[PDB]
Amino acid sequence: AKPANKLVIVTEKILLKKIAKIIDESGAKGYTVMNTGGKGSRIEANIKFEILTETREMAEEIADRVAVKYFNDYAGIIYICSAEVLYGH
Amino acid sequence: AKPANKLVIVTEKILLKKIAKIIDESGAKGYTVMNTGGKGSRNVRSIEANIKFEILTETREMAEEIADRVAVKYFNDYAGIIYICSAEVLYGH
Amino acid sequence: AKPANKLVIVTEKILLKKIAKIIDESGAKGYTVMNTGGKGSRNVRIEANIKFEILTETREMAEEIADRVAVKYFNDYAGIIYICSAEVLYGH
Ligand SMILES: Nc1ncnc2c1ncn2[C@@H]1O[C@H](COP(=O)(O)OP(=O)(O)O)[C@@H](O)[C@H]1O
Ligand SMILES: Nc1ncnc2c1ncn2[C@@H]1O[C@H](COP(=O)(O)OP(=O)(O)O)[C@@H](O)[C@H]1O
Ligand SMILES: Nc1ncnc2c1ncn2[C@@H]1O[C@H](COP(=O)(O)OP(=O)(O)O)[C@@H](O)[C@H]1O
C-alpha cells in the first residue's frame, strides 16, 4: 500500500476541460470524473472529480488553482480524504 | 482546511426526493447525488437502480441524525446502506 | 457504527461482471458500482470506466479482492485500486 490524498472537486459541468487541464498541469498522474447532481449554499447537474495525488502539496495546488480562479463565479466544493493505493499503473 | 464527516447513503433511486427532504431538514448545507448500480443482501425490493448521496456535515451529530431518520423511515421497506468517512473541507460556499 | 474498509476499484467497463464475480466470491456482502470517466497512465487505452465501492468486514477480505483483480486483469486492462476507512451506520 502507498498513503495518498484523494482530492474531490464538485463543480459546474462547464468547467470540465479547464479543471482537467489544471489537474494535468499539477503533475497528477490521473483523475476520475463523473456526472452528478446536488444542492449547496449560478437538483442542479454538476461534475465530481477524484484525484489521488502523490503528495498533499499536489492536492493543495490543484485545489488552490481551481478555487482561486473559479469559485467566485462558479459553484463548487473541494475536499480531501485519506486513501491508500494498493494497485495501479 | 476544516475537519468534516462525509455521510454516504446508497439507496433506491425512487427515494431521491424523500432523502433530499431529510437532508434539507437536518440543517446540512448541501449534498451531492449520483446514479449507481450495485448489489447487497439481494432481498426482494417491493448506473441502474440506486442513488448514492454524499453529505458533508457540520458535525458528527448532524450526520447521525440524517442517518437515523433515513433508516427509521425507509429501511424496513427499501434497500440501502449508510456509512461515514472522514474528510477535510478545503474550499466551499 | 462498525469500522470497515472501503475498497475502490476504478477499471474498464467491460470487466463489470468479472469483477462482480470476484467480489461475490470473496464473501463481501455487497458492492456499489457506477459509470465514470477518467484518464491515467494511458498504458493500454477522457475514457469511460466503472468504479466499484466495496465495504468489507475485514482488511484481509479487501486485500483478497484487490489481489485477485489486479493479478487477473491489471497487466492487460486499465485500473487502479485503493482503500479508504469507513464506519457503517446502517445496512441490510
Ligand atoms: N455540504 C455538502 N455536502 C456535499 N456536497 C455539497 C455540499 N455543499 C455543496 N455541495 C456540492 O457542491 C455543489 C456546489 O455547491 P455550492 O457551490 O454551494 O452551490 P449550488 O447550491 O449552486 O449547487 C453542490 O451542488 C453539491 O453537489
Ligand atoms: N458491502 C457493501 N459495499 C458497498 N455497497 C454496498 C454494500 N452492501 C450494499 N451496498 C449498496 O447498497 C445497496 C442496497 O443494498 P441492500 O439494502 O443490501 O439490497 P440490494 O441487494 O437490493 O441492492 C446495494 O445495491 C449496494 O449498492
Ligand atoms: N491518480 C488518479 N486519481 C484518480 N483516478 C485515477 C488516478 N490514476 C488513475 N485513475 C483512474 O483509473 C482509471 C484507469 O487508470 P490507468 O490504468 O492509468 O489507465 P487509463 O489512463 O487508460 O484510464 C483512470 O481512467 C482513472 O479513472
Side-chain angles (χ1 to χ4, degrees), chain A residues 1-16 18-89, chain B residues 1 3-38 40-46 48-93, chain C residues 1 3-16 18-56 58-92:
Chain A
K2 292 160 180 188
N5 288 277
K6 183 183 147 166
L7 188 67
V8 182
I9 304 171
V10 182
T11 193
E12 304 192 32
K13 188 177 196 186
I14 195 172
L15 302 180
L16 169 66
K18 283 164 167 164
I19 291 172
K21 182 167 193 264
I22 291 172
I23 292 163
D24 289 344
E25 286 173 344
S26 80
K29 311 295 214 188
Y31 59 87
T32 297
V33 65
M34 63 211 87
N35 291 311
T36 67
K39 282 185 195 188
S41 51
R42 299 184 158 200
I43 270 146
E44 219 85 0
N46 285 339
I47 55 173
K48 177 186 178 197
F49 291 88
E50 299 169 328
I51 308 107
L52 287 275
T53 65
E54 301 332 76
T55 62
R56 179 62 183 232
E57 290 63 49
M58 177 178 288
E60 289 168 344
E61 166 180 321
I62 296 164
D64 290 347
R65 291 186 65 194
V66 172
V68 168
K69 191 162 175 68
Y70 297 120
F71 282 14
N72 261 270
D73 292 307
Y74 296 91
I77 191 162
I78 304 178
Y79 61 93
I80 276 182
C81 292
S82 276
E84 283 175 48
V85 178
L86 304 181
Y87 289 104
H89 304 91
Chain B
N5 287 273
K6 182 183 146 169
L7 185 68
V8 180
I9 305 169
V10 182
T11 191
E12 301 193 32
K13 183 177 196 184
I14 61 181
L15 299 182
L16 168 64
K17 284 197 96 169
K18 286 163 171 65
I19 287 171
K21 175 179 185 283
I22 289 170
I23 294 165
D24 290 343
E25 290 173 349
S26 75
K29 309 294 214 187
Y31 62 86
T32 294
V33 66
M34 61 218 83
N35 294 322
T36 78
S41 74
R42 280 143 276 198
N43 296 324
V44 202
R45 317 174 161 197
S46 46
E48 183 114 291
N50 292 348
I51 55 176
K52 174 184 177 199
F53 288 86
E54 299 168 327
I55 308 110
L56 290 160
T57 65
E58 300 331 75
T59 62
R60 178 64 179 233
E61 301 93 288
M62 177 178 288
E64 291 173 347
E65 296 164 346
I66 292 164
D68 290 345
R69 292 185 82 203
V70 175
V72 78
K73 289 168 175 309
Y74 303 124
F75 279 15
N76 257 273
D77 291 293
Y78 296 93
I81 189 163
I82 306 177
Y83 59 91
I84 277 180
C85 295
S86 273
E88 287 175 71
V89 179
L90 304 181
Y91 292 100
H93 303 90
Chain C
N5 284 274
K6 181 185 149 167
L7 188 66
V8 178
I9 305 171
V10 180
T11 192
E12 304 195 33
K13 189 173 199 184
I14 200 171
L15 300 181
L16 170 63
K18 287 162 166 62
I19 289 170
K21 180 174 187 281
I22 291 171
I23 294 165
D24 292 342
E25 288 173 345
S26 76
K29 311 295 214 187
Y31 62 85
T32 299
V33 71
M34 62 208 87
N35 289 312
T36 70
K39 72 154 225 190
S41 65
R42 314 270 62 190
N43 219 280
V44 299
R45 299 198 283 193
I46 280 146
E47 216 88 78
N49 282 353
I50 58 176
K51 178 185 174 197
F52 290 88
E53 299 172 323
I54 308 110
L55 291 160
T56 66
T58 64
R59 179 65 178 223
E60 291 73 16
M61 175 179 291
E63 288 168 346
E64 166 178 324
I65 296 166
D67 293 346
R68 290 187 65 193
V69 173
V71 170
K72 187 55 171 191
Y73 298 112
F74 283 12
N75 260 270
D76 302 329
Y77 294 89
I80 188 164
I81 306 177
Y82 58 92
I83 191 172
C84 294
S85 278
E87 284 179 64
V88 179
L89 306 180
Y90 290 101
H92 300 88

